[PDB]
Design a protein around this ligand. Structure first.
Ligand code: H6P
Ligand code: SF4
Length: 309
């Protein structure tokens, strides 16, 4: 059995920054360090940080006065931010810069009383934080997840309308949604394409190349990782069996028995060690040396704030 590795795969600039923020805060201030939501959606990372004294909470009420609070890489709403500011908390923000970029545009439309539409998945923390940048009752903030949602949406003033997107969406499905938005609201304004980040676009392009060779694709990532699910989904739609897994122990022999080519990739929040362990398991199951596919070289890095270096 041949083992192929997608490239790029694994950690993106925002996830590496956000994890370092929490690690550095624990070294500087000691336990406990409060973190609003899993810093990144990865069980291995989260479990480890708990171990070292990080405490993960959903609501600011859970945090004692005098505490240090870190906002997750997915971002938070202005309401949450202000609730944290009204309290006597020391706050560090691990929101990824590429999510903050979107937030700034939503706040601008809110200040103008002009409506905005967000393409994304209901209930996800990044969608809660981005929708949570809009607070003007004169305008409006609407969420659409599909073309059918666009077909049913009515707004107050489609002459002054703009859109934004979640950073981890399917590139292909978002394209369909935007096509619909432009047909329904011909004066709608947005970015040149969408707010899907470089890491999401690159991992999806890489898994596409991987799936065209591999019969089976294993995506290292947790169940609640949006971007990771998009990678398994993409391979599955190409007609390949694809499994989202947290670690090598999740691999069932049936998935790769008699398979000549198995591909491995990892979501933006999954540490490289998990991929190494998955490769080791596939080798014990008959696989040879892991072969990295050629890919788009990534070079962006986001530094931790100086106060945590
Ligand atoms: C922070 C972030 C992505 C990094 O991976 P995560 O798996 O942590 O988050 P997501 O894909 O949104 O479920 C959203 O920009
Ligand atoms: S997936 Fe993109 S936007 Fe999200 S943390 Fe990573 S680099 Fe930032």
């Amino acid at each position: 059995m041949q083992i192929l590795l997608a490239n790029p795969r694994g950690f993106c600039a925002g996830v590496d920054r956000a994890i370092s923020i929490v690690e550095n805060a624990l070294a500087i201030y000691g336990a406990p360090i409060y973190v609003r939501h899993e810093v990144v959606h990865n069980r291995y990372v989260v479990d480890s940080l708990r171990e070292r004294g990080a405490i993960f909470i959903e609501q600011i009420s859970e945090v004692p006065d005098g505490a240090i609070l870190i906002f997750s890489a997915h971002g938070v709403s202005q309401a949450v931010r202000n609730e944290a500011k009204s309290r006597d908390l020391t706050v560090f923000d691990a929101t990824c810069p590429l999510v903050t970029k979107v937030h700034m545009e939503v706040a601008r439309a809110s200040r103008r009383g002009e409506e905005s539409i967000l393409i994304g998945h209901a209930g996800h923390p990044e969608v809660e934080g981005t929708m949570g940048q809009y607070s003007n009752p004169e305008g409006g903030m609407y969420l659409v997840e599909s073309p059918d949602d666009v077909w049913k949406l009515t707004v107050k003033n489609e002459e002054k309308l703009s859109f934004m997107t979640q950073t981890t969406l399917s590139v292909d499905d978002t394209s369909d949604v935007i096509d619909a938005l432009r047909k329904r609201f011909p004066k709608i304004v947005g970015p040149r394409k969408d707010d899907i980040c470089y890491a999401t676009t690159n991992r999806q392009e890489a898994v596409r190349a991987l799936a065209e060779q591999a019969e089976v694709v294993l995506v290292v990532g947790s169940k609640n990782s949006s971007n990771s699910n998009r990678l398994a989904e993409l391979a599955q739609r190409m007609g390949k069996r694809a499994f989202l897994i947290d670690d090598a122990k999740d691999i069932q022999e049936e998935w790769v028995k008699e398979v000549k080519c198995v591909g491995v990739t990892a979501g933006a929040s999954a540490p490289d060690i998990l991929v190494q362990n998955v490769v080791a398991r596939l080798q014990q199951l008959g696989g040879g040396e892991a072969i990295p596919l050629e890919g788009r070289e990534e070079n962006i890095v986001f530094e931790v704030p100086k106060e945590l270096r």
